[PDB]
């Protein structure tokens, strides 16, 4: 109850590799079914997967025209990776997918990725005249990330964005911003250190105010997104990391999924803190994570088998790095990436991910309804041909049907299912009348003289 009040989602890479329309409505098709309430879909992420029809901007006093960005962003997407299978969504897929999703009961949650991940809109950039737009590091240039100290790089990122939280505005509720690195590929994935280390080691090379940068630059973002009507979310791992609150604070609106608990050398604030502070918990535990193409034991981290044993052993209520607490979350979200966007995607493979995490935790995910619903338009129209007490058994049954909870979880499924046999029964059970009978018997005497 509370428990079915909680979001389900899966979270698609749809950034780094190309989905078409068809293949998402299928994933909205089985998240429907399996009582999920959400799709969160990142269209920016590596790639930028996802065109306006108009992408004109206007970022500190300069102009771009809508036909050189989308030139500019597709070139980017296919310099990161040019896929077979396509390269973009446009804005009218996007609108029908949004439709078709909304008409399931099934929300859609877009992310693009910034001030990392976002090779596709770093070369888009560099195309459109912007220089230096990427952050280096003692002359290593990150391929990802935005230098934060770039005014123009960093106003049309952001000019960027609002364009997206324009077109999502009234379609959705949430929008990730993701936030969820700072040229790890720079820095030996240290980004977030190197951010803090002016701080503390002054007079060093290390990026000026670089931390508080960042968060001004998250809040920001948020702002942005607020300013649409839309709830921010990001990934936890520059959240106040290594629980430094002394740099300022990030906006509490902002929604933060919890992906990782950190490991050595790797030091992020702890769900407690982050609850502490007011943000809200979207759990997305690694354990449940599973990479495209890594579909069995043996096949690297995060493979297929890894997922489902984390499903089993980690309930969706046990959040990364609780430092004992009792961390309230929103809900659950379980993941699959596509960081070898080349390797094939496989559905069953993917469903398999989501029927388990839907099993393992079925108090919270919703029963499926859609077999009741087809179960009634499929009673026979002409009742009239029947016997009295075969026809009261049908209308006993379908009332039972309608009168069904409408709040049942997955775990109650049974009692929809036999309701739903229960139905077919009586249905079986209808028993012509002796006038009936006589009508379809001359009725078959007709139809053999052919
Ligand atoms: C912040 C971060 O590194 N997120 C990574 C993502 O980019 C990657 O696709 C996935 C699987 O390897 O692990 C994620 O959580």
Not at 190 to 204: C, F, H
Not at 294 to 320: C, E, F, H, M
């Amino acid at each position: 109850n509370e428990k079915l009040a909680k979001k389900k989602i899966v979270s698609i890479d749809a950034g780094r590799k190309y989905f078409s329309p068809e293949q998402l409505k299928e994933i909205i098709d089985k998240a429907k079914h399996y009582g999920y309430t959400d799709l969160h879909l990142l269209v920016g992420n590596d790639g930028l997967r996802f065109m306006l029809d108009d992408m004109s901007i206007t970022a500190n006093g300069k102009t771009y025209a809508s036909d050189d960005v989308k030139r500019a962003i597709e070139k980017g997407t296919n310099d990161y990776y040019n896929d077979p299978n396509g390269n973009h969504l446009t804005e009218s897929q996007m609108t029908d997918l949004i439709n078709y999703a909304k008409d399931k009961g099934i929300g859609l949650i877009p992310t693009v990725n910034s001030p990392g991940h976002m090779d596709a809109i770093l070369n888009a950039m560099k195309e459109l005249g912007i220089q230096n737009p990427n952050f280096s590091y003692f002359g290593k240039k990150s391929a990802r990330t935005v230098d934060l100290d770039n005014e123009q790089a960093v106003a049309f990122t952001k000019a960027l964005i609002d364009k997206y939280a324009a077109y999502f505005a009234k379609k959705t509720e949430i929008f990730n911003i993701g936030l969820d690195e700072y040229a790890n590929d720079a820095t030996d994935a240290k980004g977030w250190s190197v951010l803090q280390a002016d701080k503390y080691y002054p007079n060093e090379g290390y990026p000026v105010k670089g931390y508080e940068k960042f968060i001004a630059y998250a809040n920001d973002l948020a702002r942005i997104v607020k300013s649409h009507g839309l709830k921010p979310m990001a990934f936890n791992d520059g959240i106040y990391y290594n629980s430094d609150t002394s740099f300022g604070s990030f906006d509490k609106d902002i929604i933060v999924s919890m992906w990782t608990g950190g490991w050595g050398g790797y030091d992020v604030a702890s769900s407690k803190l982050l609850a502490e502070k007011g943000h809200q918990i979207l759990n997305t535990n690694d354990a449940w994570c599973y990479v495209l193409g890594r579909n069995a034991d043996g096949q690297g981290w995060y493979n297929l088998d890894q997922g489902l044993n984390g499903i089993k052993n980690t309930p969706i209520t046990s959040v990364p790095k609780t430092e004992g607490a009792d961390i309230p979350i929103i809900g659950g979200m379980v993941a699959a990436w596509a960081d070898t966007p080349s390797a094939r995607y496989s559905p069953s493979h993917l469903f398999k991910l989501m029927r388990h995490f839907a099993n393992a935790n079925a108090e919270y995910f919703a029963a499926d309804y859609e077999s009741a619903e087809q179960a009634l338009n499929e009673v026979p129209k002409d009742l009239n041909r029947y016997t009295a007490e075969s026809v009261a058994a049908v209308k006993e049954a379908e009332k039972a049907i309608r009168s069904l909870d409408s709040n049942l979880s997955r775990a109650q499924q049974d009692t929809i299912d036999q309701a739903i046999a229960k139905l077919q029964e009586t249905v079986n059970n209808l028993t012509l009348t002796p006038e009936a009978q006589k009508e379809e018997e001359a009725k078959r005497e007709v139809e053999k003289l052919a």
